[PDB]
């Protein structure tokens, strides 16, 4: 009757929560955290210093949105965190109220973006070992968890370790290949554009292309993206002229409800049905620094690894992540990759003649469930493995060596 | 002929030109090419610009240009780009030379496909119609600037590294090896790391931006363990540089590990063995009478070897190899072993010196070059070797 | 040497995986040349000798003179820089060092084995070279069984099956009492 460990997938967006050895993440709540801050002016020599017990006088989760007298302040920003005191407060609140798990008799696994600096991991591990006194800890990249969860798509019994994952995120979407359990360290790239700035662009365009909404209830209006309201588009200008020609049937309407005066307000739906999701393959719209597509990045990263691994990698691309829920995404990526790889093969064959014909490279995109969350099941299987109880860093290791035990990274080595 | 000869090294990163019998190059310009581009982010046209521009002007006006590199690792990618660069350097404002009555010296990298040499010689003979040309190996162009008839060259530069040991003058082709490491790669890596720090960078012009930062701040270490402990125990090694736009960035730890890829190619996905280890293996694989002479005389050629501290790391590594793989830790017999790395002050440009000195005495006699006449015949090429 | 020359052609291979790839390429598309100069001249007319190989990634590599260049290193060790002689010269020297009478028998019987001697035409080239070096008054025969790869294993199995060899083995008792030096005196 051994107690199960605890599985947590922290991040910038909706933080997944639940226990190991289970088939559904029970709690999925935002990162919004309340605080009894107000208007002091001395805010850089006493940030808060709440007198008495007012320090803990703050809510958390979905209940924290509807508190109109505090401040909703997200602690995370695309992985990197400025102030981690809010993170500690959120962690204690969750573990006690929601999870109800005693740290001294439980094992915690945490997930961080691959670009997280060593200092943040070291100091969060130190904080955990000092305050929570967790017997064991383990941090790993989320790509492998997604790969493990991808087995459920079809033929679980057929072991398939090779592949590559392009995961989404509220502020980051990364690319990580797997070569029979061992990933490549140098063949990893970080994409800054993600599923948040897209909504920023949507609302920015909407605030001028339409009127009839209140400033407060903007994001709820901007969340038409999460609805059926965005389809990807093999061509841009074609659909532009399609809308500018008819502009009658392709236009949709919004019927949101105000959260203050309970007065209905409506606005039409325009070019944003596709432009947002199209920004992924044209990031230049939002971020001027990163004028680089995604599919070509995928082929480049897959072309910077040994020959024997290039072939199977193209065959296994996993559709996991919230921002990847957009329809026809896989078709576009598959078609683009096939076109570029076929062109490269033809160029290679042109220089050296021959009547032969190489077997065409096969690129296939797999669509399945688990797309919204592919890290939780990986953590559950992580906990269920007995070897996890042995690999996890121990207390005595942190006792005198320090929190450096958690500094191991997949893209470092001397 | 005109008794006029110009020596050039159309390498990968930088291109140097000059006349024979010259102590230092007259003109030094890099290999930068880029069509005009307008960035909606910031900045607009201020001064004149042309559709195709190269040379030093790019180093100053890359802000509004799509800078691209034509050559890397000494191999041909874009025939037209190299043709444009050759036209520019041969124009009346860079060299101002008469093609029909001039001779040139070329220094192609060792261990490269013959197609590049054939294409370049054919282009020179047809498009520009030079009376005669020559191709030389870096070994002579280096050892001939100080009077050395024996040694091992560790020439490193943009592209790939190379080695060409020579004993008593006669060549030893079967003891040369190539590795996929160079300055460009050390650059890609300063970049993955400052990205971690949290800065977003492109691959168009900032690639040239990081060049100065690597030149000033980047340095190599003596012992990895001590330097790493110092970095993690102290923050005095932190330094910055003023960007052209006035932005300020902090780099204290990434400035040290980038050169370490030279001795640890594992960091950049290469199954290398290390420059020092490779040198030791190459020396050992030779005969015996030549090992001591090779060790006694050794040169550190190339601009990419100007990193501060490389000689110390190399000599220490070589001594460690000698101790562990020969004497099995017997330090007492190790004392008498001696090494003297040859590091001329003019390590930024030595090939040009060798070419100038060669042309000084190899100009009067016409039986040295591939004269224009032989080109018109078939069953040709591989005239000399 | 094959890797080095493949570099001169335009194809680069450094790591061990490409070492295995080049090993397979040599195993599949290499042969010996009866005459080196004639083969080089025919290569100058490169329209019937080049062959193509399919890499795992799908890239196609065209190999010409390299097919008959690397095997020639056996007969011309100077290519790698080794100051030695070829297999023909070494065999001639070894046979000459023997007694005069047994030279005839040694010439009449020349067994070859190993995985490096499967190149087609190797036997003919060796025969021609030996006959040219040896006096042209007797007959030299080369025997090339088609199962020379496992000849050593077959011989070991046959020797073990021999009844007389059941007593020549070395057991634990005698080894422990005597020591490791026993094997040195056991049939040299």
């Amino acid at each position: 009757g051994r107690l199960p460990a605890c599985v947590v997938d922290c991040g910038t967006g909706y933080t997944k929560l639940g226990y190991a050895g289970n088939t559904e993440p029970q709690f999925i709540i935002p990162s919004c955290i309340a605080i009894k801050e107000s208007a002091k002016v001395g805010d850089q020599a006493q940030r808060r210093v709440m007198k008495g017990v007012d320090d803990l006088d703050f809510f958390i989760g979905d209940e924290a949105i509807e508190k109109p007298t505090y401040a909703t302040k997200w602690p995370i920003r695309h992985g990197i965190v400025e102030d981690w005191d809010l993170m500690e407060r959120f962690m204690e609140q969750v573990i006690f109220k929601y999870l109800r798990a005693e740290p001294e008799d439980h094992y915690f696994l945490l997930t961080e973006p691959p670009l997280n600096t060593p200092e943040n991991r070291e100091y969060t591990a130190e904080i955990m070992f000092e305050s929570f006194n967790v017997p064991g800890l383990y941090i790993a990249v989320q790509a492998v968890l997604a790969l493990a969860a991808s087995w459920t798509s079809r033929q679980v019994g057929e072991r398939t370790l090779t592949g590559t994952v392009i995961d989404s995120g509220d502020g980051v979407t990364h690319v990580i290949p797997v070569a029979e359990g061992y990933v490549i360290g140098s063949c990893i790239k970080h994409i800054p554009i993600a599923g948040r700035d897209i909504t920023y662009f949507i609302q920015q365009l909407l605030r001028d292309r339409e009127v009839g909404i209140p400033p407060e209830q903007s994001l709820e209006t901007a969340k038409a993206v999460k609805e059926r309201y965005s389809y990807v588009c093999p061509d841009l200008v074609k659909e532009f002229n399609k809308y500018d020609t008819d502009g009658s049937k392709w236009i949709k309407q919004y019927t949101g409800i105000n959260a203050i005066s309970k007065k209905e307000f409506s606005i039409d739906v325009g070019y944003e049905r596709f432009l947002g999701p199209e920004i992924f393959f044209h990031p230049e719209f939002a971020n001027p620094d990163f004028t680089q597509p995604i599919s070509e990045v995928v082929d480049e990263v897959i072309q910077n690894c040994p020959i024997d691994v290039r072939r199977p990698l193209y065959k296994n691309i996993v559709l996991s992540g919230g921002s990847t829920m957009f329809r026809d995404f896989g078709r576009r990526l598959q078609r683009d990759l096939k076109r570029t790889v076929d062109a490269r093969l033809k160029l290679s064959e042109e220089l050296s003649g021959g009547r032969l014909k190489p077997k065409p490279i096969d690129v296939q995109v797999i669509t399945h469930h688990m797309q919204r969350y592919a890290v939780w099941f990986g953590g559950s299987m992580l906990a269920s493995t007995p070897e996890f109880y042995q690999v996890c860093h121990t207390k005595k290791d942190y006792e005198e060596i320090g929190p450096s035990i958690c500094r191991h990274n997949p893209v470092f080595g001397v | 002929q005109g008794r006029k000869v110009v020596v050039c090294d159309n390498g990968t990163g930088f291109v140097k030109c000059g006349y024979a019998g010259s102590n230092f190059p007259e003109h030094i310009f890099p290999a930068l090419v880029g069509r005009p581009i307008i960035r909606s982010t910031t900045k607009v046209g201020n001064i004149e610009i042309k559709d195709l521009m190269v040379g030093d002007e790019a180093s100053e006006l890359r802000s509004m240009l799509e800078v691209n590199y034509p050559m890397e690792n000494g191999i041909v990618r874009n025939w037209d780009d190299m043709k444009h660069l050759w036209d520019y350097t041969f124009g009346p404002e860079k060299l101002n030379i008469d093609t029909r009555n001039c001779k040139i010296l070329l220094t192609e990298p060792p261990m490269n496909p013959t197609k590049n040499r054939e294409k370049i010689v054919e282009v020179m003979f047809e498009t520009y119609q030079f009376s005669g040309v020559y191709v030389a190996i870096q070994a002579v162009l280096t050892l001939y600037a100080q009077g050395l008839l024996t040694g091992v060259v560790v020439d490193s530069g943009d592209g790939v590294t190379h080695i060409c040991p020579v004993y008593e003058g006669f060549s030893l082709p079967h003891l040369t090896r190539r590795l996929d490491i160079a300055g460009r790669d050390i650059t890609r890596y300063l970049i993955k790391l400052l990205l971690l720090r949290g800065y977003a960078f492109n691959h168009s012009a900032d690639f040239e931006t990081v060049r100065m930062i690597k030149e000033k701040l980047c340095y190599v270490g003596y012992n990895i363990e001590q330097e790493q402990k110092l970095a993690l125990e102290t923050t005095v090694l932190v330094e910055s540089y003023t960007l052209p736009d006035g932005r300020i960035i902090k780099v204290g730890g990434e400035r040290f590990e980038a050169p370490e890829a030279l001795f640890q190619p594992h960091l950049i996905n290469v199954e290398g063995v290390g420059v020092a280890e490779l040198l030791f293996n190459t020396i050992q694989a030779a005969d015996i009478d030549t090992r001591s002479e090779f060790y006694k005389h050794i040169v550190l050629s190339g601009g990419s070897t100007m990193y501060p501290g490389l000689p110390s790391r190399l000599e220490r590594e070589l001594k460690q190899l000698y101790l562990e793989r020969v004497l099995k830790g017997d330090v007492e017999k190790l004392s008498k072993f001696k090494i003297r790395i040859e590091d001329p002050p003019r390590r930024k440009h030595m090939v040009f010196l060798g070419g100038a000195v060669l042309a000084d005495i190899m100009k009067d006699k016409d039986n040295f070059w591939m004269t224009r006449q032989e080109y018109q015949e078939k069953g040709v090429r591989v005239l000399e070797k | 040497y094959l890797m080095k020359i493949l570099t001169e052609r335009g194809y680069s291979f450094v790591t061990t995986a490409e070492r295995e790839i080049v090993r397979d390429i040599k195993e599949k598309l290499c042969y010996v040349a009866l005459d080196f100069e004639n083969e080089m001249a025919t290569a100058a007319s490169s329209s019937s000798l080049e062959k193509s190989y399919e890499l795992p990634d799908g890239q196609v590599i065209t190999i010409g003179n390299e097919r008959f260049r690397c095997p020639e290193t056996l007969f011309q060790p100077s290519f790698i820089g080794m100051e030695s002689a070829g297999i023909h010269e070494t065999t001639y020297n070894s046979i000459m060092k023997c007694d005069i009478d047994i030279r005839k028998d040694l010439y009449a019987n020349n067994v070859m084995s190993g995985g490096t001697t499967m190149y087609p035409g190797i036997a003919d080239r060796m025969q021609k070279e030996i006959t040219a070096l040896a006096p042209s008054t007797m007959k030299i025969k080369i025997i090339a069984p088609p199962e020379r790869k496992y000849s050593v294993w077959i011989g070991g199995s046959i020797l073990a099956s021999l009844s007389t060899f059941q007593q020549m083995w070395i057991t634990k008792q005698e080894y422990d009492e005597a020591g490791p030096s026993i094997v040195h005196r056991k049939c040299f």
């Binding site: - | 050559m71 890397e72 690792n73 041909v76 990618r77 592209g159 996929d180 | 194809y11 680069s12 291979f13």
Partner: peptide, 7 residues
């Protein structure tokens, strides 16, 4: 390069 590495 043509095969192996880019150049």
């Amino acid at each position: 390069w043509x095969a192996x590495c880019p150049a």
